[PDB]
Ligand binder design. Structure first.
Ligand SMILES: [Co+2]
Length: 323
């Protein structure tokens, strides 16, 4: 019918001060660092041992939680510059047969570099991964009520594989995971047994985290069709700051900007955007200095920034899902 246009009308249920306070208190930057983040800080390119442990680590972290997370491994083969390779996207869905989903995403693969140092891509994107896992965890009790009326809308998480290029970045050597899965979702009926509608119609908003972890990030508002949602993040950021629930935060060094961006950033959203999915692309401009550098590592992460961004994202998600 018209359920696919529902996202066009969808409003947040906005949290009051005491609610914002509780959310800020319900996240632990320390507990994420250790249990969510630290394990991912390993070489995890496709086919690598790290690939396998990354996967393992993600499925296990989601499994220990009460909320009815359903997990799928979208695994497939594709030619690469190094010859055939196996890729596996991790999908973690609450209420899989809900017509609508807000979708958080990032890439868990790390880019291949030769070596006495090793590339672990802390900001790119182990920290986006831990943030999604910390969100899953921080909001468990509230997300668990989605099991129990209201819009036909729930939460999906996606950890893409094969995001990074093997050699020099190109349409055919990158976005292996996203390109596969977006194509799959495009041809998969949703809800089950529908005419016309695909799983991509069911994607209300793809929120893609990427390159998060550096001090003073600045995110531009990239896309008009998501700009209203970007304004939410700026309003959340602002309110959390005024309430004294951010750390080492000044309005002057705020993260979410009024302005947009000139060029066109290739990333996992691309195969979704070109088929018409609303994208809220939480990548900074500029990229962290450490971009594609052996310094893209832990020492160079900024705990407080990540904590602050955790709080903002969690609040956004609650308000989007009306929880
Ligand atoms: Co990268």
């Amino acid at each position: 019918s018209a359920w696919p246009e529902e996202k066009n009308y969808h409003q947040p249920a906005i949290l009051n001060s005491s609610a914002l306070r509780q959310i800020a208190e319900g996240t632990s930057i320390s507990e994420m660092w250790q249990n969510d983040l630290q394990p991912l800080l390993i070489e995890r390119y496709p086919g690598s041992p790290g690939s396998y442990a990354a996967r393992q680590h993600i499925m296990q972290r989601i499994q220990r939680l009460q909320a009815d997370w359903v997990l799928e491994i979208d695994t497939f083969l594709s030619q690469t510059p190094e010859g055939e390779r196996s890729f596996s996207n991790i999908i973690s869905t609450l209420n899989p047969t809900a017509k609508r989903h807000l979708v958080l995403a990032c890439h868990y693969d790390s880019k291949y570099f030769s070596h006495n140092r090793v590339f672990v891509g802390a900001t790119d994107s182990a920290v986006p991964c831990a943030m999604m896992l910390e969100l899953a965890r921080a909001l468990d009790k509230k997300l668990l009520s989605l099991k129990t009326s209201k819009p036909d809308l729930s939460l999906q998480l996606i950890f893409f594989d094969g995001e990074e290029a093997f050699l020099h970045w190109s349409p055919q050597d990158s976005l292996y995971g996203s390109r596969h899965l977006a194509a799959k979702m495009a041809s998969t009926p949703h809800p089950p047994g529908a005419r016309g509608t695909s799983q991509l119609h069911g994607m209300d908003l793809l929120v893609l985290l990427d390159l998060i972890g550096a001090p003073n990030p600045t995110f531009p508002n990239f896309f008009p069709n998501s700009a209203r949602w970007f304004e939410r993040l700026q309003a959340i950021e602002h309110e959390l700051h005024e309430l004294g629930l951010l750390k080492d935060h000044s309005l002057e060094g705020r993260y979410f900007q009024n302005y947009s961006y000139g060029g066109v950033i290739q990333d996992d959203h691309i195969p979704f955007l070109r088929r018409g999915v609303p994208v809220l692309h939480l990548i900074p401009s500029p990229f962290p200095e450490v971009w594609h550098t052996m310094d893209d590592n832990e020492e160079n992460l900024d705990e407080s920034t990540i904590d602050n961004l955790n709080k903002i994202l969690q609040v956004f998600v609650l308000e989007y899902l009306h929880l």
